[PDB]
Design a protein around this ligand. Structure first.
Ligand SMILES: [Mg+2]
Ligand SMILES: [Mg+2]
Ligand SMILES: [Mg+2]
Ligand SMILES: [Mg+2]
Ligand SMILES: [Mg+2]
Ligand SMILES: [Mg+2]
Ligand SMILES: [Mg+2]
Ligand SMILES: [Mg+2]
Ligand SMILES: [Mg+2]
Ligand SMILES: [Mg+2]
Ligand SMILES: [Mg+2]
Ligand SMILES: [Mg+2]
Ligand SMILES: [Mg+2]
Ligand SMILES: [Mg+2]
Ligand SMILES: [Mg+2]
Ligand SMILES: [Mg+2]
Ligand SMILES: [Mg+2]
Ligand SMILES: [Mg+2]
Ligand SMILES: [Mg+2]
Ligand SMILES: [Mg+2]
Ligand SMILES: [Mg+2]
Ligand SMILES: [Mg+2]
Ligand SMILES: [Mg+2]
Ligand SMILES: [Mg+2]
Ligand SMILES: [Mg+2]
Ligand SMILES: [Mg+2]
Ligand SMILES: [Mg+2]
Ligand SMILES: [Mg+2]
Ligand SMILES: [Mg+2]
Ligand SMILES: [Mg+2]
Ligand SMILES: [Mg+2]
Ligand SMILES: [Mg+2]
Ligand SMILES: [Mg+2]
Ligand SMILES: [Mg+2]
Ligand SMILES: [Mg+2]
Ligand SMILES: [Mg+2]
Ligand SMILES: [Mg+2]
Ligand SMILES: [Mg+2]
Ligand SMILES: [Mg+2]
Ligand SMILES: [Mg+2]
Ligand SMILES: [Mg+2]
Ligand SMILES: [Mg+2]
Ligand SMILES: [Mg+2]
Ligand SMILES: [Mg+2]
Ligand SMILES: [Mg+2]
Ligand SMILES: [Mg+2]
Ligand SMILES: [Mg+2]
Ligand SMILES: [Mg+2]
Ligand SMILES: [Mg+2]
Ligand SMILES: [Mg+2]
Ligand SMILES: [Mg+2]
Ligand SMILES: [Mg+2]
Ligand SMILES: [Mg+2]
Ligand SMILES: [Mg+2]
Ligand SMILES: [Mg+2]
Ligand SMILES: [Mg+2]
Ligand SMILES: [Mg+2]
Ligand SMILES: [Mg+2]
Ligand SMILES: [Mg+2]
Ligand SMILES: [Mg+2]
Ligand SMILES: [Mg+2]
Ligand SMILES: [Mg+2]
Ligand SMILES: [Mg+2]
Ligand SMILES: [Mg+2]
Ligand SMILES: [Mg+2]
Ligand SMILES: [Mg+2]
Ligand SMILES: [Mg+2]
Ligand SMILES: [Mg+2]
Ligand SMILES: [Mg+2]
Ligand SMILES: [Mg+2]
Ligand SMILES: [Mg+2]
Ligand SMILES: [Mg+2]
Ligand SMILES: [Mg+2]
Ligand SMILES: [Mg+2]
Ligand SMILES: [Mg+2]
Ligand SMILES: [Mg+2]
Ligand SMILES: [Mg+2]
Ligand SMILES: [Mg+2]
Ligand SMILES: [Mg+2]
Ligand SMILES: [Mg+2]
Ligand SMILES: [Mg+2]
Ligand SMILES: [Mg+2]
Ligand SMILES: [Mg+2]
Ligand SMILES: [Mg+2]
Ligand SMILES: [Mg+2]
Ligand SMILES: [Mg+2]
Ligand SMILES: [Mg+2]
Ligand SMILES: [Mg+2]
Ligand SMILES: [Mg+2]
Ligand SMILES: [Mg+2]
Ligand SMILES: [Mg+2]
Ligand SMILES: [Mg+2]
Ligand SMILES: [Mg+2]
Ligand SMILES: [Mg+2]
Ligand SMILES: [Mg+2]
Ligand SMILES: [Mg+2]
Ligand SMILES: [Mg+2]
Ligand SMILES: [Mg+2]
Ligand SMILES: [Mg+2]
Ligand SMILES: [Mg+2]
Ligand SMILES: [Mg+2]
Ligand SMILES: [Mg+2]
Ligand SMILES: [Mg+2]
Ligand SMILES: [Mg+2]
Ligand SMILES: [Mg+2]
Ligand SMILES: [Mg+2]
Ligand SMILES: [Mg+2]
Ligand SMILES: [Zn+2]
Lengths: 83, 99, 138, 124, 99, 208
RNA sequence: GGCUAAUCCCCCAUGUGGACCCGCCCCUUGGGGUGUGUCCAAAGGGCUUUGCCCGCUUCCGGAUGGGCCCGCGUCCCAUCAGCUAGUUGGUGGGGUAAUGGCCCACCAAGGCGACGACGGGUAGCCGGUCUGAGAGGAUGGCCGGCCACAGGGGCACUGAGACACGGGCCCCACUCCUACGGGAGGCAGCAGUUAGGAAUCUUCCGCAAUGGGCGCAAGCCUGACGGAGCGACGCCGCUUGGAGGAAGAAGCCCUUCGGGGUGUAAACUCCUGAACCCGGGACGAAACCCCCGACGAGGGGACUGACGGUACCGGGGUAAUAGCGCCGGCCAACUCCGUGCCAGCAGCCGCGGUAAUACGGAGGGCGCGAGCGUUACCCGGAUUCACUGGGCGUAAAGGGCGUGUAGGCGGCCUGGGGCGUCCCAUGUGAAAGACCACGGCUCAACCGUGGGGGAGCGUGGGAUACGCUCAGGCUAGACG
């Protein structure tokens, strides 16, 4: 069930996340389909999130599901706003 | 690209099958001379259309037997029996070199 | 039989120059003639002409040397100090365009024979093509 | 050789032998002495060189040198073998290591003590 | 100990028996139709044959067959029935067959 | 920790004056006055012509001993320089000169390179307003090297500062002595630097 | 043996559609359409039960994951030269999701091999790594990808998926239970024990984060994981003080008895203030849920830490660990004493058989420094397997000579083709690493973000000198 989720790229005590499209059944940290974004929990830069919506939109079109966290980030960047 | 190769038909013995011979020249990986090798492809002649000493195109195919993956596309040229004679001889030479 | 005619030209030339001849006859063909055209252009030979020898046609390669010299060994510097085949039958060589060689940091050449014709190193770079790397000269 | 000959035949990569079967490749092996002894050196010198035949945990049995001055070792001592040869003695390819297992360090020795396995002297 | 996907085995047993049954049914029927065909007793052969076809698609409905599994078994059967129906076949019921 | 012990002896062994000592490496006590020969029994005896190796060695040595830097730090910093795009000798020198302890020295807060290492280390020093204690911190051009107002009252600090009145600071820097603020305007060149060292001898040392 | 519920099983029905046989059309390997005949569906549950949420059925496409097949690449031995019976093809058939001797019967007599078949030896493969000026050599630990195995061998069942590590049957070895009948096991999962070994950690914390399973949810599960502990195993930062201070204390060292050395080193002077004590004290964490709006969007809106009272900020504050190798040459660093072919040193050359800068201490010296030496192994050096880049008259090396098979190599002129070769376009060359730039932890190590590069191979286009090649000339080679 092809998902969209945070995978963990930082160092110990320094997380950074690649928000990615990947089959449910890969490792968290192993080969993904596409990397659509990044996340920075400790927010050490004005870029602590990014998306490329029209990409996230594509992967939604084909029925990827996100994490709840992932969905949260996606909506932060608002793949979701329809107005 | 289903792959096509071109070769000479050096054995017709089998039923509906021809032994095809395909040369490859390629530059040697270190010494850089161009060395020219080859292999026998086992290729599927359904109608026994093709005959020994022909030259054919052979195409990567849906498997026919263990060892047949290729069938016979066209006739590029008919009549090179010299080539056949080469192969027949290389193999003829084998009869020395033993015991 | 002759065997690599182009080597045999470059050689006829190498020997000729070391014994300081004014000229030499290399038996002829359009490819040698093209190799030579480039030599003349580049300043290695004086030039060359087409002659006949007992009917069978050759090329006089007229030769260039330095001026005469000081002390023991008055023999003048060579103009072709170095000439050598690179691709040979039995090992052929081909450079891409990004492999074409810098000869003596530029003061020499490389005759490449390309699909655009026979050119020097720089000539091929500026032309943007690769080829059979024939000889270097310097 | 021509090039066609290099294609046909090609250069031979060159093997080598391990001057040491401690086998196992290991940096040291543990073993149990059999003989503790002395021997007479090769031609250019003269002396008494202390050495032990050993059974090694490698299913392997070898004369091994006993470096230093004072050595305690005897016929049932269990010792750790080193590697390196004594150029003027016959068949001794390895060294014993002082301070390890039964072989104790060279006592009274003030100078090169990493080797020789001797601890550091106190001072006041 | 007593890990409880023990239950899984327990089930897999029952399922086993169910598939086996269903599938035996299928065979015995199929052969029945076939013999019947050899005999060229046409209409009879057909009525069995249809029971067989159906029971096949039923087997399909679940985990006995699914897929092309069934379709393979059916095409095989029908071909063979029809082929077997020449010794003067004149295929009476013609229920299962396109005219 | 890089070498802590009788320094003026290194003034001696490198044959030349390298003041890690501050004042008194000025005042004619440096022992480099009237005892310039190297240390130990054989110091005052003849010099056997030094191997090519030896030459290269002690030049590398002079150049390191100056900055009081570990060989580790030094050589890593060096291969840093040889990767860095452009001429290695100079690049290197600029890098070493870019060390925070060094800048603190060059700016005149402490009389010794070493003293200044203490200054960095104990956090008496800030850069762009933020305290830094790591002597190896890289000062990038445009950075502002300042004393720490907390210690701006310190005996030693204002001491050295007052002696720094009207004295001129190297051209790749600027200094304000009333605010202790300073500025590292540019990475310095071979020329900007007086170093009693042939750098290519050091590059040459690391060839082999 | 008996009772019984269901989204468990079965039978009719409906046929959107689908399966299958025969026909037709298009397409072209079993792709798509169509007609007739035959066969094929389903399950209910929860709520505020008049309407929605959770499911169920047949189909069509999507997405992601995979099966299978082909070219090419992928170690040593030729003192392994022949190998081959389902073996090689075929017809029919069984099997499968699916091609296939995958299997079975019947038919033919093939298939492979010096371009190294068969045999034997070793071995998980790659991204990459180490080394190298490069070409190359070596390697494949951790991280990522693939494979394979789960005590050894065989086997299937269930299922979308397995021939299934913590599922099942059988055989074998072993451990344990045993009323001798027979049963039970399977840490190459996290820890831990035990052996073996030179040697490799805690039977810790946590579900807070991230990820995964089931669930409408609340939520349970997770030795994935996030953390902590251990070991200088590696890398990186850091401390063992800073400044002043004798023409230079004492001890110890040589001494030409004048002196020289240790050495600004110490003592002492003064300043900072590792440890440590005190207070404050994190980010990682906003979702799931809450409410409003329609359980959407949007909008607000509150609960949620293992690490941890740790990182860190403020305050106060003590001069506060040094070691290891080496000093004959290669090689940076020399003297005295002691020993006298001994004791010993030793990588190679080679030291010691009374003046030893080579052995053993000492003073001094060099090199590194929380390390420093040693052994082992790999590349380097080694242009010493020579593609780059070697040789064979006497140094190792021309086969005793020839005929001539495969093979390698091929004069001059023109034309066709465009296989080699070259150029452009595009696809691919995952990520991580590596290179560049910027940035984030006070720095670095470490990390992030972006950029760039890249042999190779697919496709399309193009060039034709050389190399192939086909056709036609030639006569300088060769033969007559
Ligand atoms: Mg998977
Ligand atoms: Mg992106
Ligand atoms: Mg959408
Ligand atoms: Mg035939
Ligand atoms: Mg077949
Ligand atoms: Mg034979
Ligand atoms: Mg001319
Ligand atoms: Mg070459
Ligand atoms: Mg002797
Ligand atoms: Mg269950
Ligand atoms: Mg029956
Ligand atoms: Mg079939
Ligand atoms: Mg540089
Ligand atoms: Mg540059
Ligand atoms: Mg400047
Ligand atoms: Mg180097
Ligand atoms: Mg019952
Ligand atoms: Mg019962
Ligand atoms: Mg049902
Ligand atoms: Mg029905
Ligand atoms: Mg219909
Ligand atoms: Mg159809
Ligand atoms: Mg119908
Ligand atoms: Mg019902
Ligand atoms: Mg589908
Ligand atoms: Mg596929
Ligand atoms: Mg292959
Ligand atoms: Mg058999
Ligand atoms: Mg058979
Ligand atoms: Mg078949
Ligand atoms: Mg072959
Ligand atoms: Mg193995
Ligand atoms: Mg391996
Ligand atoms: Mg490198
Ligand atoms: Mg080299
Ligand atoms: Mg080499
Ligand atoms: Mg490799
Ligand atoms: Mg390998
Ligand atoms: Mg591995
Ligand atoms: Mg791995
Ligand atoms: Mg794969
Ligand atoms: Mg197994
Ligand atoms: Mg085991
Ligand atoms: Mg097994
Ligand atoms: Mg299932
Ligand atoms: Mg099944
Ligand atoms: Mg299956
Ligand atoms: Mg398995
Ligand atoms: Mg287990
Ligand atoms: Mg059991
Ligand atoms: Mg043990
Ligand atoms: Mg651990
Ligand atoms: Mg959790
Ligand atoms: Mg979760
Ligand atoms: Mg509820
Ligand atoms: Mg549990
Ligand atoms: Mg962990
Ligand atoms: Mg240790
Ligand atoms: Mg360190
Ligand atoms: Mg001081
Ligand atoms: Mg004194
Ligand atoms: Mg104080
Ligand atoms: Mg927060
Ligand atoms: Mg927080
Ligand atoms: Mg909130
Ligand atoms: Mg409401
Ligand atoms: Mg919202
Ligand atoms: Mg909100
Ligand atoms: Mg929660
Ligand atoms: Mg706490
Ligand atoms: Mg403090
Ligand atoms: Mg304070
Ligand atoms: Mg002190
Ligand atoms: Mg020396
Ligand atoms: Mg020694
Ligand atoms: Mg004596
Ligand atoms: Mg003596
Ligand atoms: Mg003597
Ligand atoms: Mg001595
Ligand atoms: Mg020595
Ligand atoms: Mg000594
Ligand atoms: Mg000493
Ligand atoms: Mg070490
Ligand atoms: Mg080597
Ligand atoms: Mg060579
Ligand atoms: Mg090469
Ligand atoms: Mg040689
Ligand atoms: Mg001789
Ligand atoms: Mg000889
Ligand atoms: Mg001879
Ligand atoms: Mg001979
Ligand atoms: Mg001959
Ligand atoms: Mg021939
Ligand atoms: Mg030619
Ligand atoms: Mg082409
Ligand atoms: Mg490309
Ligand atoms: Mg990459
Ligand atoms: Mg990384
Ligand atoms: Mg990195
Ligand atoms: Mg930074
Ligand atoms: Mg192309
Ligand atoms: Mg053309
Ligand atoms: Mg042409
Ligand atoms: Mg053309
Ligand atoms: Mg040819
Ligand atoms: Mg002709
Ligand atoms: Mg004639
Ligand atoms: Zn000084």
């Amino acid at each position: 069930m092809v998902k969209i989720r945070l995978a963990r790229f930082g160092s110990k005590h320094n997380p950074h996340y690649r928000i990615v499209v990947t089959d449910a059944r890969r490792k968290r940290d192993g080969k993904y389909i596409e990397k659509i974004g990044y996340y920075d929990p400790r927010k050490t830069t004005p870029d602590w999130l990014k998306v490329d919506v029209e990409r996230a939109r594509y992967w939604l079109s084909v029925g990827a599901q996100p994490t709840d966290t992932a969905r949260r980030l996606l909506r932060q960047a608002g793949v979701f706003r329809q107005e | 690209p289903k792959k096509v190769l071109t070769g000479v038909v050096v054995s017709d013995k089998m039923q509906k099958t021809v032994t095809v011979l395909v040369e490859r020249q390629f530059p040697h990986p270190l010494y850089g001379k161009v060395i020219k090798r080859s292999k026998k492809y086992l290729a599927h002649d359904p109608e026994e259309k093709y005959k020994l000493g022909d030259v054919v195109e052979i195409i990567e195919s849906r498997p026919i037997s263990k060892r047949k993956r290729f069938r016979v596309l066209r006739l590029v040229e008919s009549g090179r029996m010299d080539l056949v004679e080469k192969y027949l001889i290389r193999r003829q030479n084998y009869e020395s070199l033993s015991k | 039989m002759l065997t690599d005619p182009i080597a045999d030209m470059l050689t006829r030339i190498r020997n000729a120059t070391r014994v300081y001849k004014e000229s030499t006859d290399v038996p002829a063909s359009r490819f040698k003639e093209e190799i030579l055209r480039i030599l003349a252009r580049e300043g290695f030979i004086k030039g060359y002409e087409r002659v006949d020898v007992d009917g069978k046609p050759y090329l006089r390669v007229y030769l260039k040397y330095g001026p005469r010299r000081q002390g023991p060994d008055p023999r003048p510097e060579q103009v072709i100090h170095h000439i050598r085949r690179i691709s040979k039958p039995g090992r052929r060589v081909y450079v891409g365009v990004k492999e074409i060689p810098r000869v003596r940091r530029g003061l020499g050449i490389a005759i490449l024979s390309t699909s655009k014709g026979v050119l020097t190193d720089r000539e091929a770079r500026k032309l943007g093509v690769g080829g059979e790397l024939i000889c270097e000269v310097w | 050789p021509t090039i066609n000959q290099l294609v046909r035949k090609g250069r031979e990569k060159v093997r080598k032998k391990s001057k040491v079967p401690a086998l196992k490749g290991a940096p040291f092996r543990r073993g149990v002495c059999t003989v503790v002894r002395t021997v007479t050196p090769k031609k250019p010198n003269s002396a008494l060189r202390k050495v032990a035949k050993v059974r090694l945990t490698s299913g392997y049995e070898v004369t091994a040198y006993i470096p230093g001055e004072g050595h305690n070792l005897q016929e049932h001592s269990v010792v750790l073998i080193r590697g390196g040869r004594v150029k003027d003695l016959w068949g001794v390819r390895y060294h014993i290591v002082r301070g390890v297992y039964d072989a104790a360090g060279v006592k009274d020795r003030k100078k090169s003590r990493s080797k020789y396995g001797t601890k550091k002297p106190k001072e006041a | 100990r007593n890990l409880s996907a023990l239950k899984r085995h327990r089930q897999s047993l029952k399922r086993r028996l169910r598939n086996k049954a269903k599938k035996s049914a299928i065979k015995t029927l199929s052969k029945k139709a076939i013999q019947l065909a050899q005999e060229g007793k046409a209409e009879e052969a057909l009525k069995i044959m249809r029971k067989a076809e159906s029971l096949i698609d039923k087997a399909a409905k679940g985990s006995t067959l699914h897929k092309n599994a069934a379709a393979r078994r059916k095409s095989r059967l029908m071909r063979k029935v029809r082929q077997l129906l020449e010794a003067a076949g004149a295929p009476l019921i013609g229920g299962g067959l396109s005219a | 920790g890089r070498y802590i012990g009788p320094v003026c002896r290194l003034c001696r062994r490198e044959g030349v004056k390298l003041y890690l000592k501050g004042e008194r490496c000025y005042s004619p006590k440096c022992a480099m006055e009237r005892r310039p020969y190297p240390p130990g029994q054989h110091g005052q005896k003849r010099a056997r012509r030094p191997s090519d190796y030896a030459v290269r060695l002690r030049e590398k040595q002079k150049l390191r001993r100056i900055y009081g830097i570990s060989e580790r730090q030094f050589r890593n910093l060096f291969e840093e320089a040889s990767k860095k795009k452009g001429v290695t000798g100079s690049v290197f020198l600029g890098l070493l000169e870019s060390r925070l302890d060094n800048v603190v020295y060059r700016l005149g807060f402490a009389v010794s390179r070493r003293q200044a290492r203490q200054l960095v280390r104990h956090g008496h020093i800030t850069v762009n307003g933020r305290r830094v204690d790591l002597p190896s911190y890289r000062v990038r051009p445009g950075d502002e090297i300042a004393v720490a107002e907390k210690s701006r009252n310190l005996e030693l600090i204002r001491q050295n500062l007052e002696a720094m009145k009207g004295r001129k600071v190297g051209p790749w820097l600027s200094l304000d002595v009333e605010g202790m603020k300073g500025k590292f305007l540019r990475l310095p060149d071979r020329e900007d630097l007086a170093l009693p060292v042939n750098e290519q001898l050091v590059i040459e040392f690391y060839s082999r």
